[PDB]
Structure formats: structure tokens, C-alpha cells
Design a protein around this ligand. Structure first.
Ligand SMILES: *[C@@H]1O[C@H](CO)[C@@H](O)[C@H](O)[C@H]1NC(C)=O
Lengths: 50, 48
């Protein structure tokens, strides 16, 4: 799963079978990393108009 | 794939299915790759 963003700690209660989270736009919203099995939140990097 | 979903619900009703809602969480995915058209349940006998 390729993408760009800021990876932070998450407080979302992922069930054990659940791997990743998805938003309305079908982009990944959270991920469970291998080798640690901990739940990471994915937030897009800052952007806006100039 | 043989997908199995399960949920344990503690009940206290006598005969029929309790009326409510409870989602079933998956247990295991089994890469069987086989043909299935029939199924049968396994029970246990009680001998005194
Ligand atoms: C390796 O990954 C597995 C998950 O497939 C995990 O249970 C295990 O803790 C990992 N081992 C190490 C040393 O990170």
C-alpha cells in the first residue's frame, strides 16, 4: 500500500481481524504495521491554496 | 476460501431465537479450494 502522509498514534479500537481503515474517498485512513501489530493513523500532509 | 464468521451471545431464553442484532466477527479463512454442495452437522451421544 503506497501513499504519503503523517503517521501518528491512534486511539481507534481496531478489532483483531481488522487490518486497515478506509474513508469515503476509498483512501487508507489507518493502517496496522507488520512486525509491531500496532495501529497507526494516517493523516494527509498539510496543503492549501496560496 | 472458506470464510467463517462467529459471535458468542450469552442468552437466557428457552426455545426460540432471541430477537436482536449482533454482528458476526470472522474467525479464520481457509484456503480449501474445493467443491462443496452438501453439509452435515456432527453431534455427540450420551451413554450411561
Ligand atoms: C514478525 O511478524 C509477525 C506477524 O506476521 C509478528 O507476530 C512478529 O512479532 C514479528 N516479529 C518481529 C521480530 O518483529
Amino acid at each position: 500500500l503506497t501513499g504519503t502522509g503523517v503517521l501518528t498514534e491512534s486511539n481507534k479500537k481496531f478489532l483483531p481481524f481488522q487490518q486497515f481503515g478506509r474513508d469515503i474517498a476509498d483512501t487508507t485512513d489507518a493502517v496496522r504495521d507488520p512486525q509491531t501489530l500496532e495501529i497507526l493513523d494516517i493523516t494527509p500532509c498539510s496543503f492549501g491554496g496560496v | 476460501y472458506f470464510k467463517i464468521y462467529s459471535k458468542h451471545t450469552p442468552i437466557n431464553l428457552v426455545r426460540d431465537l432471541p430477537q436482536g442484532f449482533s454482528a458476526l466477527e470472522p474467525l479464520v479463512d481457509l484456503p480449501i479450494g474445493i467443491n462443496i454442495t452438501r453439509f452435515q452437522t456432527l453431534l455427540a451421544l450420551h451413554r450411561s
